[PDB]
Amino acid sequence: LEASRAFEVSENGNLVVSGKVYQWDDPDPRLFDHPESPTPNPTEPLFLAQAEVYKELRLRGYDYGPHFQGILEASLEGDSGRLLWKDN
């Protein structure tokens, strides 16, 4: 509904998702600058490799397969990491 800028995803006449979507008239790169970490902890001697992080996730109940394993690393506290990019 472009006039009211609202969308709706319907599966066989039954709603699934709803919200508002519109074009970003004046994009600003400043929004994507990384906010400072509340806890400095500059050392970070250790980190969770991909295998360890997904072991934790599966222990909790998430069973992501290879195509959705995108975390190459993540700090122990879990506030920063590196995400793989594969055009998806």
Add this chain to the structure above:
Amino acid sequence: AAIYNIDTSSESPDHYLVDHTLDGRVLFPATGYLSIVWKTLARALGLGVEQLPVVFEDVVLHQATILPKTGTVSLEVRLLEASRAFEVSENGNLVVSGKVYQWDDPDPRLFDHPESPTPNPTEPLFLAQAEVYKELRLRGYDYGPHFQGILEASLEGDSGRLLWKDNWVSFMDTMLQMSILGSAKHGLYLPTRVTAIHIDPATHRQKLYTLQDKAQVADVVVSRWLRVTVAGGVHISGLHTESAPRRQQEQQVPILEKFCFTPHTEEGCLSERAALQEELQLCKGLVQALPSQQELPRLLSAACRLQLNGNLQLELAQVLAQERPKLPEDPLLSGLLDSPALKACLDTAVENMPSLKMKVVEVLAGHGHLYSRIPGLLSPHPLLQLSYTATDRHPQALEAAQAELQQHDVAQGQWDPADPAPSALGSADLLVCNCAVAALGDPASALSNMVAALREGGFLLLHTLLRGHPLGDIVAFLTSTEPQYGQGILSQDAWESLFSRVSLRLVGLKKSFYGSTLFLCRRPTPQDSPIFLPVDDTSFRWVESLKGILADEDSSRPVWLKAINCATSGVVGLVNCLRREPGGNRLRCVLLSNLSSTSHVPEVDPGSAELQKVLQGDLVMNVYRDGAWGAFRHFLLEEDKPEEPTAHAFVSTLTRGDLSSIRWVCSSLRHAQPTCPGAQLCTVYYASLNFRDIMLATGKLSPDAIPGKWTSQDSLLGMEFSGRDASGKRVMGLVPAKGLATSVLLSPDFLWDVPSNWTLEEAASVPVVYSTAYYALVVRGRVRPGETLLIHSGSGGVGQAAIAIALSLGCRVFTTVGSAEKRAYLQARFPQLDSTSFANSRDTSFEQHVLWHTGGKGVDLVLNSLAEEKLQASVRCLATHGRFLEIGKFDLSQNHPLGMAIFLKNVTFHGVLLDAFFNESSADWREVWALVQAGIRDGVVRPLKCTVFHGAQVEDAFRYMAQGKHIGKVVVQVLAEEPEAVLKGAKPKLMSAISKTFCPAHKSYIIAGGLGGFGLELAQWLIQRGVQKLVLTSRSGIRTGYQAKQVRRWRRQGVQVQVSTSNISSLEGARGLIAEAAQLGPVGGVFNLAVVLRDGLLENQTPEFFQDVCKPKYSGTLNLDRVTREACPELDYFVVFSSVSCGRGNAGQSNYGFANSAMERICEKRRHEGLPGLAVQWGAIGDVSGTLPQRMASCLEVLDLFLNQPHMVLSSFVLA
């Protein structure tokens, strides 16, 4: 994506939408959106509209679409079946949105009329269709026949009966009209939101029933307690209407006028003016012994400087800026032409001619230039059609200014007065020369040729300078090179002699103080034996003789109606009406209307030379008043609004939404009728300007939006003030409105005492801001020490007050500001604040700031005043157990959504509004009063920065406030502060303001024929001025729904409305009526709107008709006059309503015109003795002769103006 094209062309089926006109423009019905959405849904589901019961929810209209006079507009409808939502768009713009879905199981019980909350006393009186739509028009709705669907409605507006023409839009719009009818809020209100609408065609068909006539109807019930309207198979709940701007452009512009006697000959007309005297003084000085922008002094300076004496003729006649034809522009040379004398002579000429058309030609228009001044003066006359033309000495003359001729219907000509006029001009109706500046070729030839060119009985108007006078001598010394111009100046006796030589008769002569004259002579007519028919006799039996006399259509002898025994005889109004009827050419009048007994009374016997003189004149009107012969004339009224000194004034906007119209106007507090125990009048020294005042002045906020019962016409500017109580004590107050004035009446509970240290200038800024801050924080939020707050717009007054309150308790405060200078100001004013306590209000960045510096917990109390995106951002800053204090209006007014997730965190959302206190809950207001007093005595409350504007510069104050750069508060210095602490002389200094008419509350007022429609809205207008004691008269009493509705409405408001049913025609009845009014209180004013009219040409009329027509007006005015002169000591208003029929004349209303004119005569007689009196002449009243009907609002504004004006008779009308 259904698309519907709305075409209003007569061929289109949607032609009926032309009848849905509101505020003078065609708007699409609010029910049309529902209809088109319903049709779209039915098409989508594959069913028909008559087989699809539908339900609407959360309907909101975002804008109103205006159907153009020509062309079409496209509306697009989109449905989202999953979420049961719809959207109507126009050119890609949101118009209407909501929810629509099918009603699975219709419930006929929903359409049973609810229990009558209203009492149902089975009254016999009910509103009819005409009365209902009359009320709607008066409120501002102009529905046409297709949307006129209410057959009848109850007085209160709870139940009615609606037609059904197989059109859903009309039916639902009629339902909405019924809903709006009962509301007591005056103004144009339009639907904006609806909570739920249920429609069920099956039950609709079951409910419909037919009267004895084949028309189908359906009962309608409206319940205000339950907020529901049910009619047939339609059910509307939760209707919401918001005030429209109501501003209509190209409004009627009445031609206001005065009606005063004007003697035929008068001298020294311009003696009043002062600039003319100065110009004459300058001119005489420069000629002594033989320096301004004016042409004549410039010419004298040229004659002097070039040579002191013995100037060459060539240079003086040829010196630069003295050759250009600027001579008429000299104020001395154009005095009379600017004066009303020109209008007087032109009107006298227009009166005396059979044809309604005029053929006037101007000779020597190259220099006189009257062509640019004469046509306009005759615009007021409605039906007069004019043929004007200019004739010049040579075509080269006045070829320029042709464009000025083009705009008018003025032809070109090449007549020279020296020789006879060409056949093209022929027998002209009027000749205008303007010899004052133009040069006459020769008196004898010019006059002979003109009088030859003028039809028999025609009029010739000449403007020239009189010889022997100073100005004539001055011009004679100059312009010697133009012997023709020298021939253009002669002695007045010489002019009189010349007129006789051309067998021309001078009927009028207006002469100025400096020799300028405006001659008006008419060509004689073949003298014939006249007819002397007296009319002074009562019983109107003379009408039979006049009818018999006028029967002889073949006869051409003139008829001279004679009235020499009553100054109140209205023959003047009689002759005008007849002259538009067949045989009216012969009519001519004679009236003797001396206003003072001591005045001489001449004899008009045929032997008497005076009657011979007036007969020779042959003017239609011959009125004798205090040793003079003249006739009544119309004059345009001075445009300036009268002003008088006063000690009570309020600032008001004469035109809504135009800050340039702000001016002082006299206040009703003059009488102190509002003044009373539990209240007290306090002088005002300073008044503060808030945002709401600016909104009202700019027109963005309607008067109704202010809580409380407010009159339709009133100034609601001002909420704070600081001044001295009646006992001299220095106080500061807080009022719902009317604070911005020189005196305010308020309860003693809304006043504080200004400490000794403070100053009244400072005290003008504390009340509202600190009251709202203390309320919002302590009383509602219940702020405790050590909490964290978020105060938006710290630089604003409310924000500053909140910061001062919070810092005292020792709370951490985050504030948002919009600029660096404001941040610096707040840092300077509050040393406690630190650099980690300011954010940016103009952006949503403050959300991250507060969350970061609060460690992710947020704040406990938020004082929000920002917009929708800002508001949503702020709600995310609340912490557990938070409190959201909202003081704005936009999100609340627009009804924007709010998520309930915040509630899962304990949190309390507060809608703060201080306005509720003024009208109600004064007891809970004492808590805030005590808090503010405690703050004052504890030092927490400090005055804000003030920018002072004097009283005269109030407009500049509004401008500066509108700009928005101010830090602090803007105050208006109504009166300066004396050094003393307590002053007994608290009387405000006298100030000049526009004059308004307010009536004391302890006086009785009478409206003869009040039940009649002009009388009913006159009564309502008076009540708005606070009459509180009213007596209305009528022969048959109350016999209509509208009258009963208005009477009970007024009684509910506490007015003592009395219906007398005593005829004013009989003296005993008038005395009884006056006695009855005295019971309520001393008579204040008596208005005579009684009228009984009986139309017809003079042949049809009979003495009985004349007696009947003049019974309520002529006799009634006399008996009301004498009974009020003996029984009405404190009376200050004695108004009577004449009509344009008199003065202007109207075919077939001789008796009406006579009655009105005789009415005006008595009104004039009263004013000469100093007693009150006023006759207002009206063209045509709209809501209740070549002039459009005048709307009631304009009529009442004009009437308000007239009452104050000093004249005795006035008029108003709107041209076609």
Add this chain to the structure above:
Amino acid sequence: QHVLWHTGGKGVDLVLNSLAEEKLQASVRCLATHGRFLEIGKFDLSQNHPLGMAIFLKNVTFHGVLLDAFFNESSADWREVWALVQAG
């Protein structure tokens, strides 16, 4: 309708609401000026249903009440309710 009829169309001061969905909206319409809405329910709050803010035009306070908040965090606000219950 019952409330708006027997209350003279003014409504009620306090509304102790535990219903949800449509019935919740009806209760809001029953509020009077200066009314208080105590929302002890937990369904619409969890689902985050829309709430029209036009109700705030009339002085109205919307309360979200949860007793369990006292247990997790110790505070002296509970002593007030304890004293009230003991006095009762």
